[PDB]
């Protein structure tokens, strides 16, 4: 069982005050990430293919480009596990974080897709998580979730020995239209959303509520 906390070791950059600086250096940084992360390079190429197939559909927020659309699609693919791990364990070994630009583009994609709506979502895990019974909770890493409780409890994500998270998110963005799998009814949640009302229910359910944006530990680190 893993303990929920405020994720002090997570890379949680919100890029406050350095967006323009990042948008100009990120292309070079992405190329570098690829040179240190072959899996990411392949993952990006696959997501670019998917993004190109779906983008003709609708229009997007001002400033939203191919790097943003591609980053979102990529997160809905297999690179998510390693990326989430890398972010979660950042402070423990920053020398091995080969997602400098990827993290920026995904964060920027979510921010550009921001309005003020909140969503009722669910996330199932195979690993059992325990809430200490008091205090706020934060994941640090981006996390996925689904509008569908059925998706969250599907064999892909959930086990009775694991945990089902019932979440009210207000910073999450609905990304069904930026995914390899629309059917997953995915809502992407930034790692800087903090849940101030947390409750253990039964033996494998945890409720995360009263979400709020909270200033991050890292800011414009690679700017």
UniProtKB/Swiss-Prot annotation:
It is a lipid-anchor; GPI-anchor. The modification ADP-ribosylarginine is found at residue 181. GO terms for molecular function: hydrolase activity, acting on glycosyl bonds; NAD+ nucleosidase activity; NAD+ poly-ADP-ribosyltransferase activity; NAD+-protein-arginine ADP-ribosyltransferase activity; nucleotidyltransferase activity. One of its GO terms (biological process) is NAD catabolic process. Keywords: ADP-ribosylation, Cell membrane, Disulfide bond, Glycoprotein, Glycosyltransferase, GPI-anchor, Hydrolase, Lipoprotein, Membrane, NAD, NADP, Nucleotidyltransferase, Signal, Transferase. Its EC number is 2.4.2.31, 3.2.2.5. It comes from the Eukaryota. It is found in: Cell membrane. Postthymic T-cells. Disulfide bonds join 18-220, 118-170. A lipid is attached at residue 223 (GPI-anchor amidated serine). GO terms for cellular component: plasma membrane; side of membrane. NAD(+) binds at residues 75, 123, 141, 179. Its main location: membrane. It catalyses: L-arginyl-[protein] + NAD(+) = N(omega)-(ADP-D-ribosyl)-L-arginyl-[protein] + nicotinamide + H(+); NAD(+) + H2O = ADP-D-ribose + nicotinamide + H(+). The active site is at 123, 144, 186. Residues 38-215 form the TR mART core domain. Has both NAD(+) glycohydrolase and ADP-ribosyltransferase activity (to a lesser extent). Belongs to the Arg-specific ADP-ribosyltransferase family. This is T-cell ecto-ADP-ribosyltransferase 2. The gene is Art2b.
């Amino acid at each position: 069982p893993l303990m929920l906390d405020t994720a002090p070791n997570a890379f949680d950059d919100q890029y406050e005050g350095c967006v323009n600086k990042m948008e100009e250096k990120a292309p070079l940084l992405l190329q570098e990430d690829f040179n240190m992360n072959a899996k990411l390079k392949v993952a990006w190429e696959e997501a670019k293919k998917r993004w190109n197939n779906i983008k003709p559909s609708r229009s997007y927020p001002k400033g939203f480009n191919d790097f943003h659309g591609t980053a979102l699609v990529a997160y809905t693919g297999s690179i998510a596990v390693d990326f989430n791990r890398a972010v979660r364990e950042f402070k423990e070994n920053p020398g091995q974080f080969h997602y400098k630009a990827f993290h920026y583009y995904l964060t920027r994609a979510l921010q550009l897709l921001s309005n003020g709506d909140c969503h009722s979502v669910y996330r199932g895990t195979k690993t059992r998580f325990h809430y200490t019974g008091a205090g706020s909770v934060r994941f640090g890493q981006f996390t996925s979730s689904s509008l569908s409780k059925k998706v969250a409890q599907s064999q892909e994500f959930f086990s009775d020995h694991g945990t089902l998270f019932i979440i009210k998110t207000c910073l999450g963005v609905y990304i069904k239209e930026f995914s390899f799998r629309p059917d997953q009814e995915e809502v992407l949640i930034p790692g800087y959303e903090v849940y101030q009302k947390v409750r253990t229910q039964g033996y494998n359910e945890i409720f995360l509520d009263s979400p709020k944006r909270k200033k991050s530990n890292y800011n414009c680190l690679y700017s």
